[PDB]
Amino acid sequence: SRPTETERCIESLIAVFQKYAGKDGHSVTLSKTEFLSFMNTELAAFTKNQKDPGVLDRMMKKLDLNSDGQLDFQEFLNLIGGLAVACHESFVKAAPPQKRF
Amino acid sequence: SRPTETERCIESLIAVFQKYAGKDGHSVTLSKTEFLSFMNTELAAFTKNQKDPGVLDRMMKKLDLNSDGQLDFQEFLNLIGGLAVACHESFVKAAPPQKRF
């Protein structure tokens, strides 16, 4: 597999992490702060003017950082993935009258 | 944001789940079995001829299913995401001489 919709799907989220987590191959982790810039630089639709300080702020905080001292592989998928569920489809635009704290 | 590399990245993994987890909007979950077909139908590069029964088999089993009785949002990102780390970049093609059980 290569040109498969899913194929491009996987490589997509893995790299969002790798990009900040290493441009020339360094380690299998990243940085809580390095994630900051990425979100605001390549994910404004999720944190546009911080219209919602409960999507990103809640994820990055609850991500529980303690893996090798640095970020991680799923931590990112978890970091951004969670936002997708708290900003993109899956959960949002599905239960407008069923949303609360 | 819309045409951003990350933008397409998020929508990519969310839909892999949604697609099996509902084509016309049903719920925010999926099905352990429904995931089976998806992997073999749109992710053979990860389970091609089951060359590696430790990537998918270990993920789907350890995913710990007990959310609303059905699958879930991250469960998929976790299911496929984990594979990306156990088959795609992030972890693989990074430590050839540093891999083991």
From Swiss-Prot, chains A, B:
Phosphorylation at Thr-6 significantly suppresses homodimerization and promotes association with NCL/nucleolin which induces nuclear translocation. Keywords: Acetylation, Calcium, Cytoplasm, Disulfide bond, Metal-binding, Nucleus, Phosphoprotein, Repeat. Residues 11-46, 51-86 form the EF-hand domain. GO terms for cellular component: cytoplasm; extracellular space; nucleus. GO terms for molecular function: calcium ion binding; calcium-dependent protein binding; S100 protein binding. The keyword Repeat applies. Ca(2+) 2 binds at D64, N66, D68, Q70, E75. It comes from the Eukaryota. Smooth muscle and non-muscle tissues. The modification Phosphothreonine is found at T6. Ca(2+) 1 binds at S27, T29, E34. GO terms for biological process: regulation of cell population proliferation. The modification Phosphoserine is found at S1. The modification N6-acetyllysine is found at K23. CDD domains: S-100A11 (cd05023). InterPro entries: EF-hand-dom_pair, EF_Hand_1_Ca_BS, EF_hand_dom, S100/CaBP7/8-like_CS, S100_Ca-bd_sub, S100A11. The keyword Phosphoprotein applies. It is found in: Cytoplasm; Nucleus. Facilitates the differentiation and the cornification of keratinocytes. Binds two calcium ions per molecule with an affinity similar to that of the S100 proteins. Homodimer; disulfide-linked. This is Protein S100-A11. The lineage of its organism: Eukaryota, Metazoa, Chordata, Craniata, Vertebrata. The gene is S100A11.
